[PDB]
Amino acid sequence: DVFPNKFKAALAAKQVQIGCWSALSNPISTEVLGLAGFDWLVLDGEHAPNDISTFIPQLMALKGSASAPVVRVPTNEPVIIKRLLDIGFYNFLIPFVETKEEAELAVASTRYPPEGIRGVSVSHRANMFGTVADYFAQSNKNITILVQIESQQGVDNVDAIAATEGVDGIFVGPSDLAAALGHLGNASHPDVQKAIQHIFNRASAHGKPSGILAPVEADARRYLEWGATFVAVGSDLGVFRSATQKLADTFKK
Amino acid sequence: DVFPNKFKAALAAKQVQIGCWSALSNPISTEVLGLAGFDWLVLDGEHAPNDISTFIPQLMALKGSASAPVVRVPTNEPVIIKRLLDIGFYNFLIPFVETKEEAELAVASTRYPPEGIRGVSVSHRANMFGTVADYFAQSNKNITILVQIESQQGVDNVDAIAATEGVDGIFVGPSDLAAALGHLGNASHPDVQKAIQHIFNRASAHGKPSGILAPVEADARRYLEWGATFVAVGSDLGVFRSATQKLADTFKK
Amino acid sequence: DVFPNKFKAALAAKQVQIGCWSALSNPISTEVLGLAGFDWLVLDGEHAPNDISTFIPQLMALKGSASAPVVRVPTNEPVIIKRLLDIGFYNFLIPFVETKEEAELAVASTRYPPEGIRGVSVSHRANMFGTVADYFAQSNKNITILVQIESQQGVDNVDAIAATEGVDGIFVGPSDLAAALGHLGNASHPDVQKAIQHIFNRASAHGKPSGILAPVEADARRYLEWGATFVAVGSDLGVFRSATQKLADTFKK
Amino acid sequence: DVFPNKFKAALAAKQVQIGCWSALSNPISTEVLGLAGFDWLVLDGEHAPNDISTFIPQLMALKGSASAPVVRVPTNEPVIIKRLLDIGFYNFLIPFVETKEEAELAVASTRYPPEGIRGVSVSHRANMFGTVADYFAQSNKNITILVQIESQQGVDNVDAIAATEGVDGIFVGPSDLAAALGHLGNASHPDVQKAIQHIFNRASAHGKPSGILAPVEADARRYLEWGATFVAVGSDLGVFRSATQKLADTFKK
Amino acid sequence: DVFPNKFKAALAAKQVQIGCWSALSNPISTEVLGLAGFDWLVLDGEHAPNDISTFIPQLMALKGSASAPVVRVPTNEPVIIKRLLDIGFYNFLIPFVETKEEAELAVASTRYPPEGIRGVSVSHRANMFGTVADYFAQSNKNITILVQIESQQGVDNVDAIAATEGVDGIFVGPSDLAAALGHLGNASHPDVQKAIQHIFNRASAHGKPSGILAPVEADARRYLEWGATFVAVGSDLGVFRSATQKLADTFKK
Amino acid sequence: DVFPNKFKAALAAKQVQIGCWSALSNPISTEVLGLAGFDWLVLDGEHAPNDISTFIPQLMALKGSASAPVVRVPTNEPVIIKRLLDIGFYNFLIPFVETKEEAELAVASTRYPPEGIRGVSVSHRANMFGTVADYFAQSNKNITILVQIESQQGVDNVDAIAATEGVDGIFVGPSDLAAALGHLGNASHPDVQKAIQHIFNRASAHGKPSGILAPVEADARRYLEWGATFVAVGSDLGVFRSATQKLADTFKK
Ligand SMILES: [Mg+2]
Ligand SMILES: [Mg+2]
Ligand SMILES: [Mg+2]
Ligand SMILES: [Mg+2]
Ligand SMILES: [Mg+2]
Ligand SMILES: [Mg+2]
């Protein structure tokens, strides 16, 4: 049931995918998170204490969950992507995608030659140790590549990036984008808001779905109205912090 | 700093202490939990996958937190209590205390001879490796013992148990008490509610504060009105499960 | 999905169940082991370095596997069984069951009151954090109890043990039985073989299936012919040791 | 290589064995500790955060070290001893041995039937997965049992305990003995010193070597003069705490 | 109490800071190390088995310690620095800083745009999950950057490096410097000694404090006399090795 | 006994070395794997979930094994090699070695200046914390460098690569080579077979031994006949998968 990648297809079909970020970096809470019904969960390897050692336990925790696991790599480089592919990730979120070349490299990092440069191994979690049918051929067509536009250069080259073959979705990272535009900590600033819609619009111009992280409901709904389809509406860490604080406050004397 | 035990003092003063249960068994989420402001947190070793290997990481995660760490032991026996004391626990929740003798044994398990049977070690987290002043003497007077009345025999012997020297609080375990009274999964049944009130009354009669676990706000508020002072109003697990499901439902209905 | 317990049903139907022991105590190899197709896998907590900290990772590794996970507890006592139940084990192998009383205690340790003495918790892996329907009621009828007859007293009391309500299967532990009969390391001795057949006969007399661990194919096949139905035919450790040595020998003689 | 047990032989010969306690509970520092040249190292499972999960890593860290690994069990009970034996421990320190019966039980817990009650497993670290020659037979004669006399009853019954077959050494636990004699934290009190000498004398009377833990050089040297042969002269924790504080003080006064 | 960074200020004030290296890579011994009173502790990620998985446990172990935690990164590259910042490190030691450009990149790696290129996340250990006041603004002014001059190129460009804005301290790595000058294993060679004082002197010429690692007391004091202020006087590993060996030797027969 | 490197010498002597790949990434099974008698074991860090955290436990597990540990790095870059050297690896397998420059960099990454660029540390597992005699000098001559030729560029430059000083062996990675030649998943294709023998032949032309991974016996023997000497004949993962599946199939009804 590994292939076809249902998430990748849903995205292409322009269907709304509701997601949740994951930074708690442990299999116990992540197993619980997998019961919520989110369409996709982002195991953050860039801003959370996640790595191969924590990723496998969480992927195992998510076995049976309807949620599509997505790894947000620490950076766009071929080696860590090679390693994350074999441990079982079929969907990737690439931070700071600033040029056409970088978008091409990200895609190539997930495809075996001649299409890409992915290193070959005959047995691992990805092909469930040789039990995944026609693995080598099917893998090349079933990896989701979501590139993050969150820098001025990325915005400048958004068209070339979105036009890149293999780039399945254009994702806006609000915090870094805001910082890039001189508005650190203030993504709601008008100029950042304009940049966001511009990114969504250019994604659409190239037939690629757009996405974003929006933990504030009002923002998430506005982005959805603007045409975004794969929207992360919060994070396990954020809801845990908020919910635990609220419970304590409710009884505060 | 370690001593005097403020939590123990707060209980003796019959001051309200709002707590939260912990079963996520990992230092990452627990550090966040420590920011909530709960007066006490129960690291569950009876019904959650916690053990000494997970307890120390979480105790370290809670260093600096205003929340008093309390360990709920897997069972009332000397050995594990001996080990939990040395790793840094100064507050204990003892499950299934059904007789005066069992109450006395729990207390004795936390005190050095001649008062108790606690094994002696000269350096460990508890005396912060020899840096806690007058440790041996002060330790015996600074351990909190909270006994759980959650069985028919426990209810029958509640007076002798509450009258036991060293028993700092009388805690009601709703689920086991309900089951013991023939109402598994129905702690709201009048038979159970009546026993709870009775337990609270007898704790008061012997000058000991009473407590209970009540994840439903209405229940927690009723128990507080009845006079319980150390009330756990939820769990990190319950809060996490509910909050994540809620976020998903908000967008997926 | 969790209930009804198919393994328990298969045993009641006297259907053959081929199992494999597990002592490698890690999620990496165990996930691979789950692909083999064994009807049941025994995560050994008595003679292998397994504990709750290693059990959950392996249970997660086995999610989706057709193999029924069975835990062989370190000893027949209430507390550890209580803890193993909540982390997600629905099938148990109990070592050294020597009397009717011990058999009854093992069964009781897995059932909530009034039928048993199992401690109650409202959320854990066992009820998949509150998502298992009618959990409390169904759990009591869906736990498999396999008792090990591996001592002289166990043999003497095999009838009373097999007649005990809740005892789902009569399992022979070859090594301990051989030692108990004065033939340490020689389970093939006629004295031992005779006791095994006798045990199988008495299990059948009380309508309970019998089982045994037999890493030698000829032995396993003989025991199956004698009528044993849940037979462990090897271990991940034994298989690994043998296969790796064999590969090396093929080239180094 | 595994057998014969050289440490056990050294004790029988009444040869001095200098040991060091270990509580740092991790393989990194323990590997370094194994380079020190101590005759024996005690991996403390009673007063340090050690358990099977930390024991195997440290045993592996000590492979090749001339130091004999000794585990100090959390308590004198059959089950944990059974488990510690299989993971690779051949030398045991038993806390609170107070009667002849308890001494006999500790010994029996390490020997296979008919001599003892040790559970049988055909492959584990102890027999290095089936590579230790004549394992079953040799194991029964190669386990070291060191009993701790550290309670008033233990002192009263020291003769019967020392006379017990299988008891290889009589070890004095200073801290618990002092506490038992009403001198908590004052093992130097004459009452305690007198009991120690008496214990040493009775061990000698029954042809068994005596030992003790003495982190203060003057104390260790006095005990050696009195006739103790297996003396732990410190702990990795005590040495580390002292040495690091000393280095800091050298520059900060 | 996260900001202001007291260590960073102390350094700027030219106050002597006594430090200790840490390579034991575990929270147990590191918690003990934090009680010694060192002004700073270097959790080595370049030559010790430390990484994100070991760093968080040790940072938690150091909560409450007066010692300022400093991470010595594996190499000077933006990605690992990004990750180490979010896990809670506010002080960095950068190995092999050989050019002005590299010094600039190291500084920029720790500052949010427009000042630097640090990736943005709204919740993590660094801002204690949103509880650190005015975090985004304050963080950019509270990160300590200590660059290592330990290569011939670094020596050649020491002036440009020390003149770089954001470079708070010039640290000499003796072992690599010695090797670079053709004196591997002999930092005491006259030419290496001259290079060291030259580095200290150029640091001073640009108003930046100088530092070095000197486990031999005589060397540490000489360097202090030469004007160095942040001097690491040993390591947890070195003192442990020395102290354990000395204890054993003291009793060697 | 660390130096001289016996494996490195055996290779130079053109002696056949039978190896086995390791991807199970845990110390339990790897300790067992070390008993098989393979001449070398490759702890895979490129296609298996291995890293520093898993490498040290496995190296400790292999202490006492006659098998030479070899790490296959995730990629050819100086930083991870620096780190792997200090943790105790003396033999390296470098993936995708495509040019003379890259071969030179790999060699240099393992040698201290002036020969190479290896970073210097005075105490770590590699010099067993200062106990390895004449370490600094001997290390530079005792590291085995095995470069992988598994790309078209590597084949084109095989002569320059094999001629590089310090390159001890030319290893063919079949899967990547096949993919590079347009035959993904089909290394048996005639053109790949020709490329393999060509690589072996060019290795010989420069006096360097050749090696390859060949899990199919017929292939391994053919390669040996072609002149290859360090041949990996399988993997722990592959044999485990095959052997466990076979055992289950043997009894399948
Ligand atoms: Mg971003
Ligand atoms: Mg309860
Ligand atoms: Mg048995
Ligand atoms: Mg003691
Ligand atoms: Mg250096
Ligand atoms: Mg390859």
Rounded to whole angstroms, the Cα distance separating F79 from F81 reads 5
User: Cα angle at C29 between C26 and C31, to 5 degrees?
Assistant: 95
CA of A25: how far to CAs of C32, E130, E154, F119, in Å?
24, 18, 38, 32
| Residue span of the structural domain in which A36 resides | 1-253
Rounded to whole angstroms, the Cα distance separating B42 from B45 reads 9
Phi, psi of F147 (to 5 degrees): -95, 140
Residue-wise over A142-169: b if at least 16 C-beta within 10 A, else e?
bbbbbbbbbbeebbebbeebbbbebbbb
DSSP for chain C?
Answer: ---S-HHHHHHHTT--EEEEEE-S-SHHHHHHHTTS--SEEEEESSSSS--HHHHHHHHHHTTT-SSEEEEE-SSS-HHHHHHHHHHT--EEEES---SHHHHHHHHHTTS-TTT--PPP-SSSGGGGGGTSTTHHHHHTTS-EEEEEE-SHHHHHTHHHHHTSTT--EEEE-HHHHHHHTT-TT-TTSHHHHHHHHHHHHHHHHTT--EEEE--SHHHHHHHHHHT--EEEEEEHHHHHHHHHHHHHHHHH-
Which position has the token pair 């393999």? F196
Report chain F's terminal Cα–Cα distance, integer Å: 53
Is the CB of A75 inside 8 Å of chain F's CB atoms? no
How do B17-22 and A40-44 pair as beta strands? unpaired
Name the experiment that determined this structure: X-ray
DSSP for F99-136?
Answer: SHHHHHHHHHTTS-TTT--PPP-SSSGGGGGGTSTTHH
Contact assessment for residue C63 and residue A60, using Cβ atoms and an 8 Å cutoff: yes
Rounded to whole angstroms, the Cα distance separating D234 from D246 reads 16
In chain B, what residues touch D96 (CB-CB under 8 Å)?
119
Contact assessment for residue F13 and residue F34, using Cβ atoms and an 8 Å cutoff: no
Q: Which helix (H) or strand (E) holds D19?
A: strand D17-22
CA of F63: how far to CAs of D61, D66, F93, F124, in Å?
8, 13, 20, 16
Q: Which helix (H) or strand (E) holds B78?
A: helix B78-87
Rounded to whole angstroms, the Cα distance separating B15 from D141 reads 60
E52 → closest Cβ in A49, A75, A96: A49
Cβ pair A244:B20 closer than 8 A: yes
Rounded to whole angstroms, the Cα distance separating E150 from E173 reads 5
Rounded to whole angstroms, the Cα distance separating D128 from B27 reads 35
Which ligand is located closest to the Cα atom of residue A212? 1
Question: Which structure tokens are listed for B252?
Answer: 């997926």
Q: Which residues contact B101 (CB under 8 A, 6 or more apart)?
A: none
CA of E185: how far to CAs of B26, E181, E238, F113, F135, in Å?
43, 11, 16, 11, 10
Residue C68: strand pairing partners: C40
Q: Which helix (H) or strand (E) holds F72?
A: strand F68-72
Q: Which helix (H) or strand (E) holds B156?
A: helix B152-156
Which position has the token pair 């081929």? C18
Cβ pair F129:E53 closer than 8 A: no
Q: What is the DSSP letter of E115?
A: T
Question: Which structure tokens are listed for A90?
Answer: 């079929």
Query: Resolution in A for the shown PDB structure?
Result: 1.8
Mind telling me how many Å the CA of E65 is from chain F's nearest CA?
Answer: 26
Phi, psi of F11 (to 5 degrees): -60, -50
Cα radius of gyration rounded to whole Å, chain E: 18
Report chain C's terminal Cα–Cα distance, integer Å: 50
Contact assessment for residue D108 and residue D140, using Cβ atoms and an 8 Å cutoff: no
Going from the Cα of F175 to the center of ligand 6, the distance in angstroms, rounded, reads 6
CA of C210: how far to CAs of B212, C144, C179, E253, F26, in Å?
46, 13, 20, 60, 35
In chain F, what residues touch A82 (CB-CB under 8 Å)?
46, 74
* F and D interact (at least 3 Cβ pairs within 8 A): yes
Rounded to whole angstroms, the Cα distance separating B85 from D92 reads 23
In chain D, what residues touch F56 (CB-CB under 8 Å)?
27-28
Which position has the token pair 């076995």? A63
**Of C211, C240, C246, the residue nearest C228 (C-alpha):** C211
Residue C20: strand pairing partners: C41
Question: Which structure tokens are listed for F24?
Answer: 């199970």
Q: Which helix (H) or strand (E) holds F237?
A: helix F236-251
Which ligand is located closest to the Cα atom of residue E149? 5
B239 → closest Cβ in A28, A233, A244: A244
CA of D195: how far to CAs of B238, D181, D231, in Å?
55, 9, 17
In chain E, what residues touch F113 (CB-CB under 8 Å)?
179-180, 182, 184
Cβ pair B129:E35 closer than 8 A: yes
Q: Which helix (H) or strand (E) holds B93?
A: strand B91-94
Going from the Cα of D175 to the center of ligand 4, the distance in angstroms, rounded, reads 6
Mind telling me how many Å the CA of C125 is from chain B's nearest CA?
Answer: 9
B85 to chain D: nearest residue by CA? D47
- 3-state SS, residue F145: strand
The sign of the torsion formed by the CA atoms of E108, E110, E112, E117 equals: positive
Contact assessment for residue A22 and residue A33, using Cβ atoms and an 8 Å cutoff: yes
Chains that touch F (3 or more CB pairs under 8 A): A, C, D, E
Number of domains comprising chain B: 1
CATH of the domain at A115: 3.20.20.60
Q: Which helix (H) or strand (E) holds B245?
A: helix B236-252
Question: Which structure tokens are listed for D176?
Answer: 């618990």
Cα dihedral value F243, F244, F249, F251, nearest 10: 110
Going from the Cα of F224 to the center of ligand 6, the distance in angstroms, rounded, reads 19
Residue B1 CB neighbours (<10 A): 8
* C and F interact (at least 3 Cβ pairs within 8 A): yes
Name the amino acid, one letter, at E250: T
Going from the Cα of A122 to the center of ligand 6, the distance in angstroms, rounded, reads 10
- 3-state SS, residue D147: strand
DSSP for D215-234?
Answer: -SHHHHHHHHHHT--EEEEE
In chain F, what residues touch D64 (CB-CB under 8 Å)?
63-64
Which position has the token pair 């806690």? B132
Rounded to whole angstroms, the Cα distance separating C90 from C93 reads 10
Q: Which helix (H) or strand (E) holds D171?
A: strand D169-172
Q: Could you tell me how far CA D116 lies from the centroid of its own chain?
A: 20
Task: Give residue E88's region: left, alpha or beta (phi > 0; psi -120 to 50).
Answer: left
Is the CB of A115 inside 8 Å of chain F's CB atoms? no
DSSP for F154-167?
Answer: HHHTHHHHHTSTT-
CA of F113: how far to CAs of A64, A218, E151, E154, E173, in Å?
53, 59, 10, 15, 15
Mind telling me how many Å the CA of A244 is from chain F's nearest CA?
Answer: 33
Per-residue three-class SS string for chain A: CCCCCHHHHHHHCCCCEEEEEECCCCHHHHHHHCCCCCCEEEEECCCCCCCHHHHHHHHHHCCCCCCEEEEECCCCCHHHHHHHHHCCCCEEEECCCCCHHHHHHHHHCCCCCCCCCCCCCCCCHHHHHHCCCCHHHHHCCCCEEEEEECCHHHHHCHHHHHCCCCCCEEEECHHHHHHHCCCCCCCCCHHHHHHHHHHHHHHHHCCCCEEEECCCHHHHHHHHHCCCCEEEEEEHHHHHHHHHHHHHHHHCC
- 3-state SS, residue D63: coil
The sign of the torsion formed by the CA atoms of B102, B105, B107, B109 equals: negative
Residue D177 CB neighbours (<10 A): 25
Rounded to a whole number, what is the largest CA-CA distance in chain C? 63
Residue B210: strand pairing partners: B170
Mind telling me how many Å the CA of A193 is from chain E's nearest CA?
Answer: 17
Name the amino acid, one letter, at E94: I
Residue E218 CB neighbours (<10 A): 9
Contact assessment for residue F81 and residue F106, using Cβ atoms and an 8 Å cutoff: yes
Residue B15 CB neighbours (<10 A): 14
- 3-state SS, residue E190: helix
Q: What is the DSSP letter of E236?
A: H
Is the CB of A83 inside 8 Å of chain F's CB atoms? yes
Cis peptide before F114 (omega within 30 of 0): yes
Name the amino acid, one letter, at A129: F
Residue from E32, E54, E60, E129 to probe the interface with B (highest B Cβ count within 10 Å): E60
Q: What is the DSSP letter of E93?
A: E
Burial of C99 (0-12, 13-18, 19+ CB in 10 A): middle
Task: Tell me which residues of D are annotated as active site.
Answer: 47
Residue D191 CB neighbours (<10 A): 14
- Please tell me whether A176 is known to bind a ligand: yes
Rounded to whole angstroms, the Cα distance separating A212 from C58 reads 35
Residue D240 CB neighbours (<10 A): 26
Q: Which residues contact A156 (CB under 8 A, 6 or more apart)?
A: none
Chains that touch D (3 or more CB pairs under 8 A): B, C, E, F
Is the CB of F26 inside 8 Å of chain C's CB atoms? yes
- 3-state SS, residue D110: coil
Cβ pair C46:D112 closer than 8 A: no
**Side-chain-facing half-sphere of E64: CA atoms under 13 Å:** 17
Cβ pair A124:F235 closer than 8 A: no
Contact assessment for residue C61 and residue C27, using Cβ atoms and an 8 Å cutoff: yes
